[PDB]
Symmetry: D2
């Protein structure tokens, strides 16, 4: 059985869609009718469960494996993407791109090594750029690019400086590419979540779930669905006049 | 629609962007109060248009920027909402009504400045203040700003000032209203065809079209679609935010 | 000093930050007009203090936010400048005078709102407008804002709104005045000891000290030093800018 | 003969101080009395001429060679810096750090290679981070860190996206380090020049000196001295209440 919505007929790639925010994004886009390529690095069982969840709810989805931040990453990602799309649609067209996959590594600024710096930049900033560069060859007019940033680009947090740097680089993609792609009517935007419960063990550290909840003006951490809802909107026809924007989905974390 | 059971006030809803907002909120299930100053026939067209497509709407007259304005507005609003729903509850507030008066800054009189500030900043503040007594948890406040708070134009400086004051409402009330889960946000359209004869003059249309990265002026619906999303459950985690709905006008 | 041969108006110069600004501009060589509302004895102390250290200064009385305010100000200013220099040329304008009135937003009256807007936004706009007729090329306009335009505080919302309007002056007039090489900029102090008895209450001082990343409230001189730089030749390539002089208050 | 000013007794490092903006920064800081370490990669003759110019005007300066963006770069930079400082002052203390050195490589977004990306990031963002990390061990309280960004982080320019990304990363240093260093009273700020005539050949392309001049509200490109004057201010006692700030020295380029 197939369910129809505002994205029926469209195709989407959500990077790191096996858990947390990316999972909720994929589910929401699939629910809306988009054929969703559910990307992962090593969590294939989690990805399959997301893809199945979409398919069971009457949507369409498949999984693609790609380790990002290593040589040949984009090549591997697009080989699997295009194959799955061509198989299911008879074409390689990609309408919606969500750059969600990312890494974090807390620590004192004095302990950051060049290797740690390289990894952060490689996964959070370089890969999103080259994924965008590659998607342009297969993205039709009226397409969508959404990059998942962080409110940590607007709040000083010494233990997260490397991560903030990476996301501040990522935010520059929306600015410069929105102008580049204007005549093709492809919108490029950044969405900045605040603290969001991704399920991970480090959110179940009892000295962490506190203070994080105090960041938001609402006094809670976000559910991933709250962020997914914003991304789904940006991917839609209703967000056609928004491009090159920084979209604050932090639940009032950026209030100073 | 996702706004079934909700109520909404859209100020300046008789024409232009406010009309599109009211029409889009009605379609989604909200009982819309269509506000106007002197466009009585126009407001009634919008209210009828909402009812026609299966929704519920009514009109409320209030000239803003003069003493007792908010009193008049909320007298008409609460009376109409109670007659229709049995409560004075206001879920959604859109501060859309506004004036513009372009001209050299050397020529701005104090009275022009008072008028600009009275309608674009003061009234929205006192409208928000009065709405707090009737707005349930999970409510929505949306203030229509302008890209001109980020793009320098000497001819529009007092307009800019008024909208910069308006934008402060979202910042400060978001913190105030956090524990009631009422979101407060600013929306900034770019150049938008409001139906006025101005946007039909080919040479004015061409200059304005060039401001957006798309090479077009916006249709009102494009702005309404953004406001409709902010009013919804889907934007529960967006508060105190500046939302750029300018179609790439603010790219420098 | 680097301001020798220059003239300067500092509004609200009888006390606090404006006093420090006037004292620092005088020391650098500017003929300073020390403006006040009712602090006549205080203004005279500042003017004397400038002359004592080898500079030139005088006082100008004007209650702002009431009709004819700018007329009174510029009558006194241009008369005093002409008597002292032989011209009415005004090189440096600092819009520093301001009021604050903290309190719950539910309790803001329209008259409180008018007062706030009249003194903090309207007067600075009409002061800039009148200054344009007497300001030579290479001139300077500096508007004292506040970190509260970037930090949400319900108790300060109308203050915030007024300062958000003020900040629009720099954006739009910078473009207007580009070909005259007159720079227009906003400066935002953080919590600053203005000499008032408020900053002596230990528990108020402690709370305010915590806002800065330095754990201290600012001395007025720290703000004046920033304004002094903007007024100088060294800041010729800074226009239309928001200058954060808050000591790390705006770090989120 | 020695000239005295507001920075007498202080020491400064200006990266890429052999030409353009860095040269003007060094001259201005030296003129103010700071002992200036004039850094360069391959332009040793230009650096010596800057260091001599400062010394002739009654200041103190020496040159340090270091290629940034390659392994061991920071090690090499600090070996030469500390040696020169210890020789001249008897201590390794560094009061003022200016991260000025940087690269640019225009081009269509579709032509950017990973190697081009790596180089941009390595020189403009990574090296500034590790230079800051290393300077902290030798920077006394009341110190200064100034990073030279660009107005290109606020103006969309498709041909410069990689460069914008690098500078957007660089701007995150000021935000996170200002909070980290608050109790040590070290200020960390970003300064964003607009178009500035650095002398380079690419500024003498006649199809380039046009349009660039139109960026500023003043209708000219900046002289390097105009930017240096802003940096000198930030390095001074008068800028003690400014930290974590983005300082717009673009001559009204950011007006939209
Ligand atoms: N959580 C927050 O509070 C929060 C706040 C603001 C912003 N964000 C951002 O939101 C995005 C997702 O956050 P999250 O908390 O949901 O993350 P998450 O739970 O840790 O999951 C990260 C996702 O990225 C994938 N991934 C990680 N490294 C990868 C790599 N090298 N190559 C390919 N895929 C990789 C993971 O795949 P596998 O299953 O194979 O490991 C997973 O699907 C990130 O960009 C994060 O920066 C999160
Ligand atoms: N159009 C654009 O390009 C554009 C761009 C950016 C932002 N905006 C902003 O978006 C909002 C609407 O713009 P627009 O072009 O659609 O409006 P436009 O047609 O003037 O429509 C104005 C609406 O506001 C009402 N109004 C005006 N003054 C009023 C007053 N003093 N008291 C009560 N109502 C008053 C008018 O009522 P009546 O019909 O009774 O006179 C009308 O409904 C404004 O805030 C404007 O600043 C517009
Ligand atoms: N202090 C802070 O923590 C702080 C922080 C951020 C921003 N600011 C801003 O910096 C500026 C000065 O602050 P402050 O604390 O130093 O001032 P504070 O002592 O009140 O001093 C006010 C000054 O402005 C004058 N003034 C007030 N109302 C006036 C009016 N209606 N017409 C003409 N003059 C009037 C006063 O004149 P008289 O002596 O004649 O009454 C006095 O000279 C203000 O714009 C304020 O918003 C202050
Ligand atoms: N020019 C503009 O309009 C403009 C506008 C905004 C921002 N900026 C920024 O201002 C800063 C300086 O600009 P500029 O135009 O003066 O640059 P410039 O004339 O090209 O000189 C660059 C300086 O950086 C050094 N350098 C380059 N690569 C290096 C490396 N890999 N390792 C160590 N040093 C290296 C050069 O040393 P050598 O002499 O040995 O080659 C030189 O001293 C840059 O960060 C640039 O991004 C410039
Ligand atoms: C273990 C851990 C440490 C953190 O420092 C954060 C988180 C986890 C969640 C997260 O990624 C974030 C923050 C965060 O403060 C923080 C502070 C201010 C804004 C914001 O978005 C964040 C944020 O997203
Ligand atoms: C007659 C007239 C003059 C204007 O100056 C505008 C308009 C009409 C339409 C309008 O309201 C706007 C602009 C506008 O430039 C302009 C410039 C930059 C941003 C922006 O939103 C606008 C804008 O919304
Ligand atoms: C009684 C009183 C209440 C205040 O709320 C402030 C002050 C006094 C001093 C003051 O003017 C300021 C603040 C302030 O928080 C505050 C919060 C965040 C930024 C900021 O600049 C300020 C600020 O300048
Ligand atoms: C060859 C060349 C191309 C450029 O694109 C720029 C420059 C040289 C000088 C430069 O680095 C800059 C810009 C620039 O537009 C530009 C546009 C808007 C702001 C800004 O700072 C710049 C800018 O600094």
């Amino acid at each position: 059985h197939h369910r129809s919505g505002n994205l029926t007929g469209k195709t989407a790639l959500v990077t790191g869609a096996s858990r947390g925010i990316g999972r909720a994004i994929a589910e929401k886009l699939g629910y809306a009718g988009a054929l969703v390529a559910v990307h992962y690095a090593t969590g294939a069982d989690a990805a399959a469960e997301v893809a199945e969840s979409i398919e069971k709810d009457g949507g369409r989805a498949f999984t693609v494996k790609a380790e990002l931040g290593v040589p040949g990453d984009v090549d591997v990602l697009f080989e699997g993407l295009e194959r799955g799309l061509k198989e299911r649609t008879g074409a390689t067209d990609l309408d919606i791109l969500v750059n969600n996959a990312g890494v974090m590594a807390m620590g004192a600024p004095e302990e950051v090594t060049p290797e740690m710096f390289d990894r952060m930049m490689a996964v959070n900033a370089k890969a999103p750029f080259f994924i965008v560069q590659r998607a342009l060859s297969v993205m039709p007019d009226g397409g969508r690019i959404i990059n998942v940033s962080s409110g940590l680009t607007r709040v000083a947090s010494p233990d997260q400086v490397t991560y903030g740097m990476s996301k501040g680089a990522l935010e520059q993609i929306a600015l410069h590419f929105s102008r580049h792609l204007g005549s093709r009517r492809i919108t490029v935007n950044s969405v900045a979540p605040g603290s969001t419960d991704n399920g991970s063990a480090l959110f179940q550290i009892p000295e962490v779930r506190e203070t994080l909840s105090q960041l938001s003006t609402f006094g809670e951490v976000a559910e991933p669905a709250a962020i997914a809802d914003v991304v789904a909107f940006l991917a839609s026809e209703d967000a056609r006049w928004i491009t090159g924007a920084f979209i604050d989905a932090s639940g009032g974390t950026l209030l100073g």
